[PDB]
Amino acid sequence: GHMETGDQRFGDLVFRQLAPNVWQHTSYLDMPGFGAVAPSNGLIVRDGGRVLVVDTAWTDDQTAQILNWIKQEINLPVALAVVTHAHQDKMGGMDALHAAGIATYANALSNQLAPQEGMVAAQHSLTFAANGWVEPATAPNFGPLKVFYPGPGHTSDNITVGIDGTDIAFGGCLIKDSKAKSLGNLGDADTEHYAASARAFGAAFPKASMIVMSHSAPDSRAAITHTARMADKL
Template sequence: MLILRALCFFLLFHGFVQAQSSPKPKLTVTPLNDRVYVHTTYGIYLNNAIPSNGLIIKTTDGIVLVDTGWDSDGNTDNTRQLLRWVADSLRQPVRLCIVTHAHEDRVGGISELRKAGVRVISTPLTAQKSLKLGYEAPEGILPADTTFTIGQEPIRCYFPGEGHTSDNIVVWLPRHQILHGGCFVKSVAAFGMGNVADANLNEWGNSVRRVMQQFGTARLVIPGHEEWSDTKALEHTLRLLEKHAASKR
């Protein structure tokens, strides 16, 4: 009986160690259509592997990325995998990366992109905050609301106001009616607000309403984490904000 108990303990402990030390999931890429893909990499938050979403946009003049892979502590393997996937699968150079705010799941892979000769851009505030956090700074050239075209693909970058962070922007692809909300938008699968360490909870709801006014026709809304949907994600974000506020009263 003693031997059996010892064996059960060993198997249980061994399984626990295996689970704790198992590697993060690798990069996945999901096509939304023949021109736009979601890249998903994983980071660790509160000891859990969390998916982080960005975009890959295929244009006639090369690839545009929205956000780097989720990289931290100088390990840029996720962004390296992303560049390798683009080279192997799309066989086009990456021309540009737009980062949507200064957290590691958005800017952590900038150094890897720079090594590959990729231009990385953001708002001036995101560039400043990236440096303060110890990351390479993107070029802080984006106005609060601007549309530019690369390879016949119009791309709009819009600052709706403070929310998840003071510098969060969203990216709109009008030809496809796709909105990349980043961490400013919560997935319909989310039960809570997640990381609000840098959030402006008082203004976030007002900023979401501005996005709904500007991009209410969105066919797809891509949140920073977990599964995507349509504009229900924006409505869900408002509900979560209301629930969070009520819990603090």
């Protein structure tokens, strides 16, 4: 009963505590004269005496505001950040993380695609085994973060993250909730492999009951089945 319930506003950002040491951060794409659209979610994880971040906000200014909220609410240094693909909603704030002295990690393919996508690359590159699990030497001192590359889906480089010791797995933009009308921005998608990649994510974190994703609120495992079924139609 100690966790604050529901959405907490911090300027134009929204924070929601999901577990004793896990929060979801939400930022919107701001368009002058038209307002805010396309909310995007990331994660904040408290791991003992440090904080780990999953994904930036849409911009450097909003990412600096996530860091300000962390300082105010948690007051522990941010040791590292993992970004889940080279799109503006996940990597838009890389400069703000680097200005704060935060070590950044992304799939090697995300770093290679980043300049073509108009993104700043993460400082370090994650590589993966043929079964999709991160090569441990490329993800040093990741604490409870279990990084998995499910195969091409939302993009060819999308990665996912399970939080050890919790019921949470983060599907990023690969997964949409059980009520979603579409899979969202499909311009860079792999329509042939998407369904198998969504199913591979489910199988990599078989015990996770809370599925967190970029463009829907947290849901049950039905979000995985629903996404794979919508991807089967591509």
